[PDB]
Design a protein around this ligand. Structure first.
Ligand code: HEM
Ligand code: HEM
Lengths: 182, 182
């Protein structure tokens, strides 16, 4: 995944637990050499898995818990590190924002040629509820999707309830989340 | 499971989709003969699974979604059909409520001698997060746990974020959920 994602993790851990903590994770993660991550360059997905892993260990939190937190953090980080306009253009409400996500990730893909974005389909079951389908070339990130949705809820001052109803990691075709929102 | 659970299910479907809908489910579920469920008497778990299975068909919702909705309904239903005091004595916050949950079910067990209550262990990873272990003599109810958790969030005016990180149904030892809450 592009360095942006890894800068963001790093940013999150450093603001929340400081540079030493970060350095520890960095060290444990096997990446002592990387001086700084390059936003617009593509790294191996491993760099991210190891980072998450190392943070799990150093912080005594399951990885999934960290993915959730990284997920809602990402909504703030992007609004402030140069994608706020792009974010805003993608919707004025959660359900609109989710319908526009594939599009958002395509506008991003222009600037980022090796992007493997996720694919998201929304099936509205009511004007306050939807069933969100997440499809991905990667495994393990469903918990991040969940944090992102909670991030978007805070952004649009909207209360949101999210429960994952189907799982890839077992052998269901893709992750589905049932969502309820004001 | 004791009749209470099945009354609550009925009560939920009747209040939300009317008696004619409930009656269709009752019929399809193969239980036309049962006039009313007896709260404090024990039924076979089948009754509940057939009940759940039927509501899925009649309503055209996956079972998992119904469980999740049943799970949050239960929190209200119990507060009003005679377990409000007991509910309230069990905590003034989510993390406290979950720590006292085994005790709650033991108190209940004094009244319901054939109860097979689930067992719930909390490992607090921070003052805003935990790793929740749910152990049960039964399979398939993890989604219900997820609704119950959202139900307790509303009760204590607390945003909660839940992802299941392990699954009985695959042959992991028990269900584990990673939880973040205000
Ligand atoms: C708003 C600005 C956003 C930007 C600039 C952005 C950009 C990106 C980038 C660069 C990646 C890495 C992909 C790769 O390296 O192959 C990515 C991945 C991802 N993005 Fe976003 N994104 C944004 C918003 C969102 C939101 C709001 C969500 C969810 C609601 C989302 C969901 C994801 C997911 C789930 C992935 C993981 C990739 C995967 O599943 O394989 N993104 N995004
Ligand atoms: C006043 C509150 C409550 C009462 C009176 C109550 C009572 C019961 C009863 C009677 C059963 C049926 C078990 C059997 O028939 O053998 C049961 C099952 C269950 N209860 Fe509760 N309960 C309460 C609150 C909660 C809460 C708040 C949760 C939240 C997670 C919970 C989780 C469960 C679960 C998961 C089961 C399924 C049994 C299993 O997994 O084996 N209960 N409870």
């Amino acid at each position: 995944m592009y360095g942006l994602v890894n800068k963001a993790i790093q940013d999150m851990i450093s603001k929340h637990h400081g540079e030493d903590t970060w350095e520890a994770i960095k060290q444990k993660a096997g990446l002592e050499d990387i001086d700084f991550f390059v936003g617009m360059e593509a790294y191996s997905d491993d760099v991210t898995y190891h980072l998450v892993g190392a943070a799990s260990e150093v912080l005594g939190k399951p990885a999934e818990e960290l993915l959730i937190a990284f997920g809602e953090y990402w909504v703030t980080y992007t609004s402030e590190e140069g994608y706020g306009e792009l974010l805003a253009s993608a919707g004025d409400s959660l359900p609109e924002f989710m319908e526009n996500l594939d599009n958002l990730h395509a506008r991003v893909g222009l600037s980022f040629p090796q992007l493997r974005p996720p694919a998201f389909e929304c099936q509205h079951t009511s004007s306050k509820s939807m069933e969100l389908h997440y499809q991905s070339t990667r495994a393990g990130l469903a918990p991040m999707v969940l944090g992102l949705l909670h991030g978007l809820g805070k952004r649009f001052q909207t209360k949101v309830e999210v429960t994952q109803t189907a799982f890839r990691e077992t052998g269901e075709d893709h992750d589905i989340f049932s969502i309820k929102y004001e």
